[PDB]
Each structure stands twice: as structure tokens, then as C-alpha cells.
Amino acid sequence: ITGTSTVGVGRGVLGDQKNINTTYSTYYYLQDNTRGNGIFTYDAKYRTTLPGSLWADADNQFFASYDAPAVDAHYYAGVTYDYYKNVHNRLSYDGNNAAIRSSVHYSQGYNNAFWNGSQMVYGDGDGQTFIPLSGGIDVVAHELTHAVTDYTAGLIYQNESGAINEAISDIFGTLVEFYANKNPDWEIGEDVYTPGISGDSLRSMSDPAKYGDPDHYSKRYTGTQDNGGVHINSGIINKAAYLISQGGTHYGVSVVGIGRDKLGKIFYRALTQYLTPTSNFSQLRAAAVQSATDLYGSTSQEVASVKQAFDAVGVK
Numbered sequence: 001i002t003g004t005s006t007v008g009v010g011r012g013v014l015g016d017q018k019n020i021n022t023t024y025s026t027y028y029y030l031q032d033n034t035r036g037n038g039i040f041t042y043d044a045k046y047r048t049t050l051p052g053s054l055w056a057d058a059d060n061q062f063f064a065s066y067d068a069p070a071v072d073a074h075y076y077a078g079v080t081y082d083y084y085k086n087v088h089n090r091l092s093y094d095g096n097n098a099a100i101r102s103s104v105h106y107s108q109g110y111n112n113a114f115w116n117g118s119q120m121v122y123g124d125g126d127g128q129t130f131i132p133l134s135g136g137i138d139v140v141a142h143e144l145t146h147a148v149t150d151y152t153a154g155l156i157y158q159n160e161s162g163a164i165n166e167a168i169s170d171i172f173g174t175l176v177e178f179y180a181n182k183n184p185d186w187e188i189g190e191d192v193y194t195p196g197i198s199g200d201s202l203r204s205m206s207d208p209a210k211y212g213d214p215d216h217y218s219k220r221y222t223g224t225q226d227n228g229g230v231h232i233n234s235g236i237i238n239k240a241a242y243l244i245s246q247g248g249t250h251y252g253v254s255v256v257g258i259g260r261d262k263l264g265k266i267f268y269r270a271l272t273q274y275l276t277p278t279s280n281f282s283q284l285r286a287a288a289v290q291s292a293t294d295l296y297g298s299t300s301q302e303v304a305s306v307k308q309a310f311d312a313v314g315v316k
């Protein structure tokens with residue numbers, strides 16, 4: 001909508017207060033004009049038609065409980081925008097400042113979130129399994145990273161390329177969480193999963209096995225569920241990425257960690273310059289090696305740590 005840029009205030013899902021960029025034109029809309037061609041958050045109103053109505057509020061204060069998922073969806077899209085711009089020099093998900101749109105209050109008691117090819121969608125959770133999923137910055141960045149991948153490598157959402165697609169989203173979801181630096185970890189979705197159970201999550205990058213995900217190529221799922229297990233076999237890549245950053249010994253294979261930022265530079269480059277829609281695991285290894293090479297030199301620790309990590313998860 002056409003109107004004047006302003007700043008609203010409200011509370012997110014976890015009860016935290018934050019300012020949000022809005023647009024005024026009779027009502028205050030969740031439209032952020034300070035980032036690229038804009039960040040727009042919508043109300044799906046418990047239904048599934050998308051995107052719904054551009055979020056509208058009479059007084060620019062968003063402290064209702066109904067407001068919280070939109071507050072966080074909107075704010076964390078902005079944070080994720082900032083990560084990609086400041087850290088990888090990338091403008092929005094298409095690299096050309098595409099408008100970022102999100103809808104919240106999708107369906108009823110919907111325990112999930114997703115990128116539908118054109119926008120982010122967030123359920124409110126059933127309240128026991130999940131709380132509104134936009135309360136999770138790793139979730140928000142996971143979903144926007146799916147748009148990044150779709151505009152770059154275009155990894156097909158099936159089998160090994162689909163597992164890579166997933167890992168990429170968990171990896172930058174996590175790097176963005178660290179970036180915001182609020183209770184960061186290598187777990188996914190912990191902030192909005194099972195409010196009544198502390199310490200769990202949907203997936204663990206540091207120890208995928210925690211939730212039954214493989215942490216080695218010899219443990220890969222080869223059935224047809226989950227698109228050929230894209231959320232399952234992603235643990236093999238998540239584990240490699242964790243090792244590259246943090247280091248460790250895994251099934252007897254030692255990795256020297258090079259830290260999060262270099263992990264991020266290497267995988268961003270692999271994603272945007274080498275990976276293709278049908279890249280498999282072994283191809284990912286060669287892309288990451290070439291990326292590390294480009295960035296740090298063939299003889300680097302960096303290159304050597306990337307090899308160690310993939311050796312440790314059995315990917316040659």
C-alpha cells in the first residue's frame with residue numbers, strides 16, 4: 001500500500017517487546033519500506049487461502065496475543081534480510097530486492113510452516129506440540145532460505161538434492177539465529193516446539209541421531225517417504241556443516257572447526273556458484289571444496305577441514 005513509513009511496537013510469541021517497521025494509510029500496516037522492495041506480513045485468519053489480508057492495525061501497537069505471530073514473522077523476516085545483505089551482499093531472496101511476503105494464522109492448530117513458491121506461511125501450532133512457528137527465528141530464516149535456494153542452485157526437493165536443499169535451510173536458519181545472537185544453538189525450532197518440554201527440538205545439527213536422523217552416509221534413508229527423506233538425510237549434511245564450523249571427532253574422524261562465518265561463506269558460495277538442481281551429496285562435497293579453495297586457497301586449513309568433515313559423515 002502507498003503511505004508513510006512509521007515504526008510500531010509490540011510483543012512477539014515469546015513475550016519479548018520489539019519495534020517493527022510499518023506503513024501508515026488510515027491504518028498501520030505490517031509493511032516495511034526500509035528493506036529492498038519491502039517486507040509484507042499478512043493475516044490468513046485461520047484459513048488456508050493465501051496470502052490473506054495485508055496486516056492492518058488501528059494504533060500501531062501490537063501487544064494483542066493475536067498480534068504476536070505477525071510481529072515475529074515481520075521482524076524476523078527483516079533480520080534475515082539483514083543477514084543476507086550485510087553478510088553475503090545479497091539483496092532479498094532473488095538477489096534483486098524482491099518483496100518478502102509472509103502470512104500467519106494459517107489454518108487452525110497448524111503444526112508447521114513453509115515456503116509455497118512465492119511466500120512464507122506460518123501455522124499457529126496446536127498449542128501443545130507447537131506455539132506460533134514465526135516465534136522461531138531459525139524457522140523464519142529456514143523458510144526464507146528455501147526461497148534463496150530456489151532462486152540459486154534450485155535443488156530439486158527430492159532424494160539427495162532435496163536433503164541438501166533442507167540442510168542449506170537449517171544451516172542458514174542457524175547462522176541467522178547466531179547472527180541475531182539470541183540464545184543461539186545448532187538445534188532447529190526449539191523456541192516454538194513443545195512449550196511444556198524443555199531442551200528438545202525438531203532436529204539437531206550437532207547430533208542428528210538425537211531425533212533419529214542419520215549422521216553418516218551409511219545410515220541414509222532410501223525409502224520414498226518425506227520425498228525420499230529430505231528431512232532425514234539432511235542430518236548427514238547438517239552434521240558435516242556443524243563439524244566444519246565447530247570441529248570434533250566423529251566415528252573416529254577428527255575435524256578442525258573454522259568457525260561459523262567461514263562455514264557461511266563457503267556454503268553460500270557453493271549454493272550460489274556451484275550447486276545445481278540435481279546435485280547429490282558427493283557433488284556437494286566437491287562444490288564446498290571448490291568454494292573453500294576459491295576463498296582460502298588450495299592449501300588452506302579451510303579446504304582441509306571441509307574434506308575432513310565430509311570424510312567424517314562418509315561422503316566422498
Ligand SMILES: CC(C)[C@H](Cc1cn(Cc2ccc(C(=O)O)cc2)nn1)C(=O)N[C@@H](CCCCN)C(=O)O
Nearest residue numbers: 111112113114115129139142143166188189202231
Ligand atoms: C522447524 C521447522 C522449519 C519444521 C519442523 C516440522 C514441523 N513438522 C510437523 C510436526 C508435527 C507434529 C510433531 C510432533 O512431535 O507431534 C512433529 C512435527 N514437521 N517438521 C520443518 O522442517 N518444516 C518443513 C515444512 C516445509 C516442507 C515442505 N514439504 C520445512 O520447512 O522443511
Ligand SMILES: [Ca+2]
Nearest residue numbers: 057059061062
Ligand atoms: Ca493495535
Ligand SMILES: [Ca+2]
Nearest residue numbers: 182183184185
Ligand atoms: Ca535458540
Ligand SMILES: [Ca+2]
Nearest residue numbers: 138187188189
Ligand atoms: Ca535453533
Ligand SMILES: [Ca+2]
Nearest residue numbers: 193194195197
Ligand atoms: Ca520444547
Ligand SMILES: [Zn+2]
Nearest residue numbers: 142146166169
Ligand atoms: Zn525446509
